[PDB]
Every structure is written in structure tokens, then in C-alpha cells.
Amino acid sequence: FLRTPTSFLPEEDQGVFMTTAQLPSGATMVNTTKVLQQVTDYYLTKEKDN
Amino acid sequence: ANYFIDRPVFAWVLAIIMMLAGGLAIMNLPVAQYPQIAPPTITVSATYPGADAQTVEDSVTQVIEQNMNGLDGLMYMSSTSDAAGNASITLTFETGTSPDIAQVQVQNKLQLAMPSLPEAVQQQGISVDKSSSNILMVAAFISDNGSLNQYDIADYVASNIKDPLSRTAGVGSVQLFGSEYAMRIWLDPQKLNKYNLVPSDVISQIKVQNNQISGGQLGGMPQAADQQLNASIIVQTRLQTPEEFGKILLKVQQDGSQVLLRDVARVELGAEDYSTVARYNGKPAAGIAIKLAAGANALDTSRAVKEELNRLSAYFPASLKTVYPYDTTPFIEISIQEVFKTLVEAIILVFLVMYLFLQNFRATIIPTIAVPVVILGTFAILSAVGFTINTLTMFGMVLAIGLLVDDAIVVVENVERVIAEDKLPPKEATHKSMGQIQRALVGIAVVLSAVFMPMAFMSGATGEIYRQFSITLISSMLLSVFVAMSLTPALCATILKARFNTLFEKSTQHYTDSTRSLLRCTGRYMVVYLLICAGMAVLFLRTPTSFLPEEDQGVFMTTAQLPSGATMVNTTKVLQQVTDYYLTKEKDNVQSVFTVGGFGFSGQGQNNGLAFISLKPWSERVGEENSVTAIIQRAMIALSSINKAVVFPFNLPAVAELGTASGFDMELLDNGNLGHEKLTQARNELLSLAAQSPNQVTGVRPNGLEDTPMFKVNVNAAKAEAMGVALSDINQTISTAFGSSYVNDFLNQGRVKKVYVQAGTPFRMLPDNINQWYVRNASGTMAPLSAYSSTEWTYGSPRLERYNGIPSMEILGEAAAGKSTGDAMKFMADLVAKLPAGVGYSWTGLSYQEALSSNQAPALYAISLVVVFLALAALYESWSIPFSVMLVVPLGVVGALLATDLRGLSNDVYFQVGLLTTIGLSAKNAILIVEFAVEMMQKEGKTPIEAIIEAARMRLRPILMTSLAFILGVLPLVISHGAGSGAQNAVGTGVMGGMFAATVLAIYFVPVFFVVVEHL
Amino acid sequence: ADAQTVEDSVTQVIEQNMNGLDGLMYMSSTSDAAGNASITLTFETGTSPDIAQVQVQNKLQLAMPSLPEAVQQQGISVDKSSSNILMVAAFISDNGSLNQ
Amino acid sequence: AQSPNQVTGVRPNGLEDTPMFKVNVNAAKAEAMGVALSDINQTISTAFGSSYVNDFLNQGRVKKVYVQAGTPFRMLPDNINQWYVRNASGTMAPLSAYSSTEWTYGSPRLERYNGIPSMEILGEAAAGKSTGDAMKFMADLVAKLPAGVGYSWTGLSYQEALSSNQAPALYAISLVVVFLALAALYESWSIPFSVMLVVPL
Ligand SMILES: CCCCCCCCCCCCCCCCCCCC(=O)O[C@H](COC(=O)CCCCCCCCCCCCCC)COP(=O)(O)OCCN
Ligand SMILES: CCCCCCCCCCCC
């Protein structure tokens, strides 16, 4: 009873998830838009099956 | 039922469950001196800096009062408008209304009403507070070494103490006795004259330069493509140091010299509210008042707050101590400890009595374990219904202990008797005795519940105390019946086996021989009974009425009031005299004196002051010479020589309800159209007409302040406008100079603080100062203020008051001798009717509850009689028998009345609950005698006399055991004189004597009533 | 406004009053550099959200007089809703006529 | 970050300090030439920030009207040189005259938890470990930090920590309750022991 790890509730596959994209402080919306476009391209090409 | 006898393990498990639930209850249960008793109130406070009484009443008070409608459960609403610019509107809501709902309703109405108030009171903000009186602690902060003055300590306690606490459990209405820092700017009329400036220019430049400008963003959005930079812009920031406020550039002269604010004014980190001076033991200090919360624990909250102060005492800058004046926590702790001691001593005495009577350790072991089971179960029930452990509930349990003991004794005595005679084994004997007393026990439960419910169903302030008492008694009684039916029979089944005794047998034989004389003069006996009954009524018409006895809470308060128009210098002097007396001529008893001048209970002012006075712990003052009552009555005579003050010490009110059943509070509403002068003329017709008849009303004193001189400045608009100066400029410079002018906010040590502008101290203290200020024409020239304005010395009021939207006067009085409240509030009416036409009267606060529902007392005490009659008829299966169970209650009533009246008490609530307990016990004894008598009549054929005598002989011992145990249990309560002595004596002297008369007269009269009823 | 500007002139003012009302399990407060103050009080399980909002709003106007202007003609937005998105519904243009 | 076998992907839920433009306006120099400080402040604030002026009607709905400088005139530290402020006599003087621009540093987002500043942190547990192990590991990691910093679990962590302490007590009351129930149902104290000696199995 002391060797077992502790937890609250197991993780589940809810069918959705999120990704955050944080740029260096002082960057503008142009660079953030480019970064998010790269993220969208990766997800929509390399994960087109899921 | 009787199936627990065959299964002792079931009964033991139920007992263990009761004990566990009781322990879990007492571990987590709120403790307090008293529960919430006063009807919920909502207080609306508004501040108008510098406004008069009339100006406040005309602008802030009336507008707020006109839009307080649609509130549910609103009994009345009273408003006070001071001369310091404070308007306070209190709305009293009905009992049971949710205070949060009432607060939100009032605040929403005020939210919609706000745009009508002047900007100067809008800027301060109007505070709606769900809170009442009965401050918990007045913990104060003092300077040890020096340097730190009043304002510095007040600012520290406002900026790093008030907010860190007030999140503690049971703490929700913290009030301050100081004022946090501000950026007081003191103007100089001559320096302003030299540079051709006015306070308006100073205020405008402060508003312009002490501003927070939103710079925006370099870059920002929408942005062009190829934008790689995005930063904020800083343009300005609110000033922080007082040296920065002195560099504000008011103007630039043609010569080129710069005029700064420091050149026309003295800037200084001062205070916001300057009209409050707090001193601890003479030393200057500033403190806070912790008004507790609705649902609170009066003990652990105190420990947690003390621990918080110890924790954040290392953050204290230097030489700052954290003393605790007031602090009425030890009184609650001592009261609860004493009641627990009484409860345990009752069990010890009961065990001793059972040993001395039954003379069998096995026999006596049963109640000694059965009683704590019931006590713990009742604690669990009180926690399950949501009842806090306070003085009322514990003192109700003090009668409950005797009620449970009586059941335990009767069960054990019957089992012991049946194993004694008839040679029945313990189990068979237990079955026999329980068959004998089973339905009698349930009938007794019904009768006692019917006796106790009427007190449960009252309303108002009385209703809550009565509810606490009756809920406690009902829970304890109903649990005791079930436990006596379940736990006790198993214990008697498994425990008992196969000098004074001879004296008791001889006494019982003598009693039977004397009781046999029913065949001689029975009728005359009844006549005597009637006389006693009549005497009871006579006593019931002589005992005075009171609410609760005053206690030795350990602290009291003195109020020093200067006559009128008296400055803070004289008030501080008078309070210094008061604290010097209390700390040099009473040093043995008095520990601390915390004197706050300016803060009077009758209202803020420079002619008021109040001193909290603490006392050395009860372990250091003993007797009557060193109690609170004697201390205040010794100090009253000593302080009559305070040389122009009306200082008046007094003890803490019980729950702040009323001044005994003699005090009344009427208000003389003007109505019609008559003004304030014609209303004060009516108030002067009264206070004299009433004093002409001192047989009914004595202390008719006019609560409220009286007329004072007032300076009047008559500006001449025509001349001023003809020669160039607008009336706005004159009216603004006078107001800003003499009566403060909030400008904006600023940042100090990471905290937002106000900025004020006022005239210099020496330039606003005399009527000859007004002709020292100058105002600017349209062409830039400056002209004196005396060329326009004239001066007068008119008369005016310093504190106006209104009631329900009608100008009132608040005449409060007291009843004379034995004349009760009702005759007082009947004589004040029909005396108001003789006043000039227009004025009316209204009862408030104390008399209101007694002006809408008064017949709510006896209807349920007649319903109780009807219900108990029905229950008894069901028990005995006849209609005439219950009369000789009803004819026994006056026997206990008259005894309790005598034992109370001939010792020095009154008709307090504790007397009422003790009287009902004695009534219940007498009814139970009569029920149990008549039960055996009727069983003999209906089962083993006998005559109405031969059966009743045998029943009385059988029941002699249980009555003499329970009554003696109950009398001895409450005996130390009567003799106690320490902390909480009044409540102890009240729950003592009554029952101790009600029980004695009940037992003696019941055992000597029940056969007479039985014979008369059966033969009639 | 700036981050410190907001955190001192708006967040401090609103924060000066909410200390403990019914069940305050814990309190958070963020102040951005885009002019955004986001106090996020969290009460104990079983508290009535309506009563909690009532208490929060009856203690917020004890701080309202200390707030500046241009925070008013936009409006304070007390909310008792959840803090986590339940559903996002996006709207697009099929052919590409309407811009964002 | 250097202990990947316990905690993986620990990141802060906040924003880092940024450079910030600062403008200093000479009140004395401005007031000497007649241009008011209030007017300068208002022009700068409206140009680079915005100004909600009024409401108006669009397709039957009330919307807001905003005044701001154009996109090309709001982008560079030298753009502040193009704005002119009107004198008290009607003449226009450039804003670059009585002003000085510099750069400083400032935080773009300030946080507070329970009333004190905070730096809320996110991060998952490494493979093989559980959230309790990572929670304890980070509580240990905090102890090796400069004095003047604390740690507070919040959100899901609050409830997980509460449950971990709750459970053993709940086992205790459940065992005592089942013992008492058996003792009451069966009139004996033997079965309550012969049965309660089996729960470890
Ligand atoms: C077989 C018998 C022997 C074995 C018994 C075993 C029982 C063991 C444990 C018994 C103790 C628990 C049950 C006793 C009552 C406690 C629960 C009271 C709950 C409570 O607080 O309600 C009170 C109602 O008064 C009350 O006490 C309820 C009044 C109920 C109506 C009574 C008659 C009313 C008048 C009608 C006259 C006509 C006669 C009707 C037949 C007051 O309410 P609160 O404080 O919550 O409210 C506040 C706002 N007001
Ligand atoms: C098994 C029969 C027991 C005796 C008759 C029932 C008595 C009920 C009394 C009132 C309820 C406890």
C-alpha cells in the first residue's frame, strides 16, 4: 500500500486536444500567424489519417 | 420496544453509535455566547466631506430614502444625518429574512438611485453593509518606543493588517479606528494671493498632472505587414512621493520664474478622516473592531486571529505592539467550561444518590452509563439540525440532564423492585416491569412534547431564545424515551443479579398511615389546594419581568459627552481624566483603558467619546467589591466630578435587546407639513407633560442632539457679478478652503490613496479668517472675499433624524416601578394626542415587537393543555382520569414562584424554561402514580382508594430519588457567583424549589384528586 | 493601458475588497498589457453560484468608487459561468467572398 | 528540465518581460511656449492608443466609433516626431520639441494568487511515473530554491492532494462501521472478529 503511486483520475481520449504556440516576447502578429500556419500545415499533412 | 432485552448486543451497538455520533458532533460544532437573535439589519453609509446636517439631509439622505421601495420583509427604516457629512440609513428586516438577499436588494436600489446624488458623495462611494452591533474584539496596535504617531500606526493597520485578516473564519465586518494615509495639501491664502491663484487652479493642475495616461502600443493592431516590433508606450504615471506633489507646475510667470505647488501650499502625507483620536492607556494608538460573522466559532476564530497577529508581527516595522482590549472570548470559554462541569457533577451526584438509595453497585451502574449516551446523542441531534453550542442550548441541556435522570431512575427502580420481590430472575423481571411502564413512557413523551412545543413556536427576538431552549429540551426528552425503552432494559437484563433503609421504611409507613386519612376530610383538602392556586396567581402578578440577567463579561464601556460645540481638545482632556481615574484609583481591577474620542454611539462629533474598559481576569477579582457591577457603581459617583462632561459608565447589554421590561422607544414623527422648529416645540411640550406625571414614565430623555450656533456666509451675487467675480468661484473657494476637496487618487507603497485639498490650519479657525481669502475677476485681478459676503451667527441642528421618510425625534423612556411596558406605551399615546395638530407617534426597535402580536403567548399554552388532555385520555382510556393529572401543575408553579420571588430574581427566560421543566416532571410523577392506580382498578379488582394508596406506596421511592437527585444537581448553580452567575442562578433558584414543592405536594395531593375525580 | 497601469489602477482597486465571503477556496488575478483585469475567485464545493455572485457583486461596489474612467464606458463583466470552453463553433466562407 | 525521468515538459503559464517605449514630456518647457500638458497627453494617447467617442447605427444595431492614428503613423519610435500640438495662440509646434524618448523593460502580464504574485507552472509526469510522484518530486524541488518563494497546488492538483489524504481515514470509518453492523445484526462479538480478520486477504 506504500509502494503504489498516487493519482486522481486517469487520462482519457476525448477525441480533441490543443497546442499552444508562444513566441519570444516582442514578436508581432505576423510571426505568430506564420507559426500557427506551420502548425496547421503539419497537422493537416502528416496526420491526415487522424 | 421490549425486543432489545433479548438482544443486548443490538442495544450496546446503538449506544456505541450514539456515542460516536455525539463525539463527532462536539468535535465540529460552532460555539458562541449567543446565536443570531436581533432581526437582520442593512446599513447604508454615505459621506459628504464638509457638508452640514441640513445639506446632507437635503441631498444624500432624502434621495436615498425616496428610492427604498420594493424591499421584502422591511419593518422600518431610520436615517441620521450628521454635521460631519455622514448619512446613515438603517433598514430593519423581519426575522428569518436572508441578510444577503436583503443586502443585495438594498444595494441594487441604491445602484439605480446613485445618479441623483451630488458628485462629491458619489466620488467617496456609498457602502451597504450587512452587519449589526456586538463587536467581538477591539484588538489595538500601540507604539512601544516612539516615532510612530497615530496616523502612521493607523495607516499600517489599514494597509497591511485590515486586508490580510477579515478573511479569517468568523470574521466579516472589520472596522477601523484610524485613517489611512493621504496627500493632504494645505493651502495658504496669502501665497495664493501673491501669485493670483485660487484653489480651483490648484485642483485643476493636480487633476492634470497626477493622471494616468494610456500610452498605447508602438506597433499595435491593425499592423502593416513586415512589422517586427510591438512595445507598450508609457506617457505618465500617478505621482507617489509627497515631494513629487510639491513640484507640480501651477503657472509660469513672465519673469520666467516657475510657480510650483510647494510655493503656495504645504504638501504632507496626512490622514483622510481627521476626526478620531484613539489612545491606549493614555498612549496614542489605532485599533480595529472585529464584528464577527453570522456563522462563526467564537473561540477558534479568536485563536486564529491571535495566531495571525503573532505571525505577521515580524513584518511590523518597529516598536509596534498588538494589544487586545475588549476580547470577550474568555467569557464564552469560561461559561461553556462551567456548564460542562455542572453536567458532569450532575452525573456524579446521580450515581451517589442511586448508591445511597438502592445500595447495589450493579443497580447504580446502569444510569451512570445510560445518561452520557443520551447526552452525546442529543449533541449529535443538535448538530444534525444545525444548532450551535451556546449558553442557551447548554443551559437547556442543564434541565435536560434531570429529565433524562428521572427516566433512568424510574426504569432502574422498577426493575430493582421487581427482582427484589416476587423472586423474579433479572430477565423475567425486566420484561414484567417494562410491560408495566411501556405505554406510560410513551404517553409521558407525548405530554412532555406538548408542554415544550408552545415555547418552540414563538416569534421575534423572544422566539429565537425560546426556540433554542425548546429544541434542546425536545431533542433530549425524545431521545431519552427511546434510550430508556431500548438501551436500559438490556442493561438491566444483563447486569443485576438475584441505617437509611429502616428509616425509609418507617417514613413510607408513616406516609401511608397519613395518606389513609382521605376518608376523613378530603373535601377540605381540595379547598386548601384552591387557595395555593390563588396564591400562585398572586405571585404571578408580583414577579417583575426581565429578558436576560446581566453578566460579568469582563469589560464595560464609558461614554463621555461634552455639552455642545466643544472642540476635540476638551474631549481629549475629559477622556484623559476618565482613563487617569480608571487607571490610578482602580489599578487592582482595571487592566486597560482604550479611549476613542470622536466616535460616539450617538454619532460622530467633536463633543463625543467612548472608552472601552477591560478588567483583570476573574481569578484576580473575587467577591462583590471587585465585580463589574460594584466597579461601575463606584465609578459613577467618582466621575460626577469630571468638570463639564456627562460621562456615564455602563455594563455590556445582554444581547442588546432592551432595558428590562420597562424601557420603550417612541418616535414623534412630525407628519403634516410642520417644520423642524414646530417639531422641536412639540418635543418640548412632551418631555415636560410626561415629566408632570412621574407615576408611569421616568426616563423620558430626548435621544438626539440639540441646536447649536452656525456661521452663515451671505454672498452678494449682484455686486460680485457686477464687479466681475462669478458666484461659482466664490462658492467654490469658500467650500474648498474650509471644507476639504477630494481631487483624485495616487499610488503610495503599491496602494491607492486619496488626495485632498484644504486650507491651512491657522487660516480656518476664526470668523475673522473669512476676510483673508481672495477671488479672481474675469480680467485676472484679485479682490477680497469681504467685499461681497456678510456674516451671521444663525442657529441650526447638528444631527437631523428621520423615520420612515418622516422627520422624527426618537424619545426613549422607561416605565415607573411596577407599571410594566404596556401601561407606558398606553400613556405615551393619548399624551401624544394632546400635542399640536399634525404630529404622530411610532414605536420602534424595542416596542415594535410588542405592538403587532401580543396574544401569541397564551394561545399555544392553552393548546398544550388540550393536547395533553387528549394524550392522557388516550393513555388511561377514560375521559375523567386526566383531570387528576392536570390538577398537579399549579403545585409546582407556586413552589417555583416562591423559590424565585423570595430570593431576588424575576421572570427571566431561564425562569420560564425551568418552570416548564418542573411542570413536566410533576406531570410525569402524577402520570406514573395514576398509571399503577388505573392498572390495579382495571386488572386486579379493587376500590378507588385501596388501589391509589398502594400505587402511591409503590411510587414513593422513585419520586424521592429523582426529585432529590435533580435538586442536588442544580444546587451549586444557586450558590455560584463567578462568571456567568446570573444565568446559573436563574436556572437554579427556580427549579431548586419548584421541584421540592412539586414532589411534596404531588405525593400528598394526587390521591385526593384521584378520589374526588373518580367519585364525582 | 499597460500591464502595470492596469494591475495598479484597476486590478488593485477591485482586489482591495474581496477577501473572504462564503467559501473562498482560492483566488487568482491576472492583469495584461492589453488592458485586461481578470480576477477569478473560486469558492468551495457546495456553494450556491447565485449566492456567490451576489456576494461578489455586493463587495465589488465597495471598490467601484476607486476605479478610474474609460474602464466604465466599457463595463465590468462579472460572470458565474465555467472557465473552460465547452464547444467552439467556427464560421467560414465557402467560396471565399467574405473576409475575416 | 534536467530530470526527465520524473517530470516531462514543465513550462510556465505566463509571459516574459518585454522592451517598452517611454516618453517624457517637459511640463515646464511646454508651458513656457503655451502648449498645455493635457493637450499633449491627449494627442499622444489618441494617436497611439484609441478613443471611444460615440455610438452609431449600422444595419439596425448600435456599434462604437473609434479614433486612432493611421497604420503607417503608429509603427516606429520616430513616428512620434510627426505629431503636432496646437499652441495657445493657434500656431502648431511639433511634439518632438518638448519630449524625450527612451526604452525600458516591463512585464506584459502580472499575476497574483491568493493575493501575492505568482508564476503558475504547468508540466506533465514522465512515463512510468504517476501524477502523485511528479507532484511530490516538484514539492521537493521547490525546497531547493532561494528563500522567499513558495508553492501552492491548485486546480486538479488541489482535489488530488485532498483525495490522497482522505482515503485512509475513509477506510478506517468503513471498517468500524461494518464491524458494528455485523455485531448488531448477529447477536455476538465473535463473528465481528472472525469476519473482520479476512479483509487483508
Ligand atoms: C415512539 C416515541 C418514542 C421514541 C422516539 C424516538 C426518537 C429519537 C430522536 C427524537 C428526536 C428527533 C426528532 C425530534 C424533533 C427534532 C427535529 C426538529 C427540526 C426543527 O428544527 O424543526 C423545529 C420544528 O419544531 C418541532 O419540534 C417540529 C414540530 C412538528 C409539528 C408538531 C405539532 C405542531 C402544532 C400542530 C398542533 C396540532 C397537533 C398535530 C398532531 C423548528 O424548525 P426550525 O428550527 O428548523 O425552523 C426555523 C425557522 N422557523
Ligand atoms: C411485541 C409487542 C410489544 C408490546 C406492544 C407494543 C407497544 C408499543 C409502545 C409504543 C411504541 C414503542
Author numbering:
A (entry chain A): 554 to 603
B (entry chain C): 2 to 499, 513 to 1030
C (entry chain A): 52 to 151
D (entry chain A): 705 to 905
Lines quoted from the article behind this entry:
Bacteria can resist antibiotics and toxic substances within demanding ecological settings, such as low oxygen, extreme acid, and during nutrient starvation. MdtEF, a proton motive force-driven efflux pump from the resistance-nodulation-cell division (RND) superfamily, is upregulated in these conditions but its molecular mechanism is unknown. Physiologically, this provides means of xenobiotic and metabolite disposal within remodelled cell membranes that presage encounters with acid stresses, as endured in the gastrointestinal tract.
Here, we report cryo-electron microscopy structures of Escherichia coli multidrug transporter MdtF within native-lipid nanodiscs, including a single-point mutant with an altered multidrug phenotype and associated substrate-bound form.
